């Protein structure tokens, strides 16, 4: 085994980085960009889709977690399979499934079918990170592999910014009407299609063929690589003098057995320690990162809510008689008023409350109302015509000889206003995504100088320390700075992981092990999101404690990992 890895390292090491490597880099960054775009869609869609699709808060949470659940399943499935059927074929299958289901999700009406489409889209896109990294790792040599793999992490943020830009450039046009959020979904379903388009032109890497006793295809693929790189470097005189490489329903059951064997061989005596260290590291890092990255926007929203409450204005003791009104009201309280023989026509209300009021012989007609209530109010001989007033809008009131006529149809569930303040979401996500650029650059430049282990541990401990500064920012302005700081100072820890997991497992098990670890990452992400979403407003010590302890565990386990810098990839 090890002898082949020496010979394999020798072939590509001579042809050197060149045309073929950059071509594969771009055509694989397309798949990574597709993943980055996919993980943002449902988030930029909930505020607008919550009206058409009549979405409760429970449905919002389930939709928020469906992408991560699908990504977990897809990572495990496609990683397990790719070690048998190849990397190119499996990536094509998974990306095509993602594109198909993500396109169908745009022309879908019901909530359950939308959830199913999004889950299958996540299953399709789960296997991009493992297959892409493992597959590109087999066209690189050890002198600079770490930097080469680290520049491949840049396309994920490119996809994030693409999704944010399209969301900003499509969703706010609320007057189009099929509204604009479906168009945003369809437009964001494109990079996967381009990924299949650009992936069909690339050979299946020769390492898989060699590991599968298919040295002929390995030789022809290596010949393509050499020919392309030499044609690039303007040295057609050179000849590929390298000789042949060293030689070493039932179908579904056989594939399942082979995948199970690959997975079970990861816990063998050689790889038990490494595998357990990696399980702990991936779990802890994912838990902390996802918990914080979803806790920050929630805190911004809650702090804005407190400001909104502090901006309310109260109107006590108003008496109105024989007056008509058609003027929109917002963020107001009206207490202890009396309205006799009043007509309210074309009235729009938002976050308006009425307490201890009295209505007698009044007349409502065509009233819209969000977060509007009637507490301890009395109605006598009042008529409600074509109104948005539901049963739950009357809290502790009593109505005598009133009437509801032409009751306006629509979603009964409230908090479903077409337009919510989602602009802040787009800009916050855009800044958070840009925060990873300096981290990506420094990590890519210094991975092969500092080393995988040292960079991983340093970034992890720095993030653990930076978490303590959470309490130092209590304003909406400080939370953005903290979000950019945590995101940009922790991204290196992720890159060092992707390079470190790739270089630590045998070529026959690299995709299986990486897929299992990414599935564990997505599971930990789900758990972290769930736990941390219950801390907003409660306090500020709990998130600090949880995310500092988890990153401490991660750094402790990370420091006990082998080193892979300057070692041949086996």
């Amino acid at each position: 085994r090890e002898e082949l890895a020496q010979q394999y390292e020798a072939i590509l090491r001579e042809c050197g980085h060149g045309r073929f490597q950059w071509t594969l880099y771009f055509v694989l960054g397309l798949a990574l960009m597709a993943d980055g775009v996919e993980v943002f869609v449902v988030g930029f869609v909930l505020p607008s889709a919550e009206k058409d699709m009549c979405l409760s808060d429970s449905n919002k949470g389930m939709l928020g977690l469906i992408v991560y659940l699908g990504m977990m399943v897809g990572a495990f499935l496609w990683g397990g399979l790719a070690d048998r059927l190849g990397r190119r074929q499996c990536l094509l299958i998974s990306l095509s499934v993602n594109s198909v289901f993500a396109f169908f999700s745009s022309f879908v009406q019901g909530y359950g079918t939308f959830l199913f489409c999004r889950l299958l889209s996540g299953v399709g896109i789960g296997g991009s990170i493992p297959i892409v990294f493992s597959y590109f790792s087999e066209f690189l040599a050890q002198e600079k592999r770490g930097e080469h793999l680290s520049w491949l992490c840049m396309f994920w943020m490119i996809g994030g910014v693409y999704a944010a830009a399209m969301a900003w450039a499509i969703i706010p046009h609320y007057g189009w009407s099929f509204h604009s959020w479906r168009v945003f979904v369809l437009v964001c379903a494109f990079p996967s299609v381009f990924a299949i388009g650009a992936l069909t032109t690339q050979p299946e890497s020769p390492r898989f063929f060699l590991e599968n006793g298919k040295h002929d295809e390995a030789w022809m693929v290596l010949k393509q690589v050499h020919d392309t790189n030499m044609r690039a470097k303007g040295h057609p005189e050179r000849v590929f003098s390298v000789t042949h490489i060293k030689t070493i329903g039932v179908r579904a059951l056989s594939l399942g057995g082979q995948v199970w064997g690959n997975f079970l061989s990861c816990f063998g005596p050689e790889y038990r320690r490494i595998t357990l260290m990696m399980m702990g590291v991936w779990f802890t890092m994912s838990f902390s990162y996802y918990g914080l990255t979803v806790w920050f926007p929630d805190m911004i929203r809650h702090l804005q809510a407190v400001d909104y409450a502090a901006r309310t204005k109260v109107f006590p003791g108003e008496r109105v008689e024989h007056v008509t009104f058609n003027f929109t009201l917002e963020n107001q309280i009206h207490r202890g008023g009396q309205y006799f023989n009043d007509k309210f026509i074309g009235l729009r209300l938002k976050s308006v409350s009425f307490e201890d009021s009295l209505f007698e012989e009044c007349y409502f007609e065509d009233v819209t109302s969000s977060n509007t209530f009637f507490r301890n109010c009395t109605f006598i001989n009042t008529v409600f015509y074509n109104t948005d007033l539901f049963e739950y809008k009357f809290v502790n009131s009593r109505l005598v000889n009133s009437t509801f006529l032409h009751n306006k149809e629509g979603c009964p569930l409230d908090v479903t206003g077409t337009g919510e303040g989602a602009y802040m979401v787009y800009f916050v996500s855009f800044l958070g995504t840009l925060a990873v650029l300096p981290g990506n650059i420094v990590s890519a430049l210094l991975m092969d100088k500092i080393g995988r282990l040292r960079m991983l541990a340093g970034s992890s401990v720095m993030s653990c320390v930076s978490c303590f500064f959470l309490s130092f920012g209590n304003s909406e302005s400080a939370m953005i700075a903290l979000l950019c700081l945590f995101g940009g100072v922790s991204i290196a820890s992720w890159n060092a992981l992707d390079v470190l997991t790739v270089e630590l497992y045998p070529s026959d098990k690299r995709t299986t092990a990486f897929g299992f670890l990414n599935a564990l990452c997505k599971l930990a992400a789900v758990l972290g999101i769930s736990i941390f979403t219950s801390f907003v407003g409660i306090t500020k010590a709990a998130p600090i404690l949880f995310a500092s302890a988890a990153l401490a565990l991660g750094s402790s386990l990370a420091l006990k990992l082998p080193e892979t810098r300057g070692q041949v990839l086996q």
Partner: nanobody
Framework: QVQLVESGGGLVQAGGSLRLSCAASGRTFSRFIMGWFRQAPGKEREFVAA????????YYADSMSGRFAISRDNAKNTVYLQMISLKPEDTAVYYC?????????????????WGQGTQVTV
């Protein structure tokens, strides 16, 4: 299908007081507006009162408030109609019904289920 059963009727002396209890046996009881109707001899079922989905707000028909008090207990899974100062006019069969909607309704058609009935004689 929620089954509603009424009780507490009978003959009552004029100017007295009486209470009608409507028991429901379905875990899903708090998702309906509970309406009390009455049917007099020769007339139709006329809406009397209704109580919302959380026991906060009531909805009284015309000429009823002052003699009818409607409430609901969500722990005992029941609805209550208290009547007082009963006159000879208030002789009828009282029915209990459920509406699953999000608007208060006085039309008998809009109510989903219906109770058996009780008799009140003055």
């Amino acid at each position: 299908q929620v089954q509603l059963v009424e009780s507490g009727g009978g003959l009552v002396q004029a100017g007295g007081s009486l209470r009608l209890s409507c028991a429901a046996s379905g875990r899903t009881f708090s998702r309906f507006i509970m309406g009390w109707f009455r049917q007099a001899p020769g007339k139709e079922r006329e809406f009397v009162a209704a109580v919302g989905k959380s026991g906060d707000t009531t909805y009284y028909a015309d000429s009823m408030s002052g003699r009818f008090a409607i409430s609901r207990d969500n722990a005992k899974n029941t609805v209550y109609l208290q009547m007082i100062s009963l006159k000879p006019e208030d002789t009828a069969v009282y029915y209990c019904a459920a509406d699953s909607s999000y608007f208060y309704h006085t039309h008998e058609s809009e109510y989903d289920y219906w109770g058996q009935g009780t008799q009140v004689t003055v």
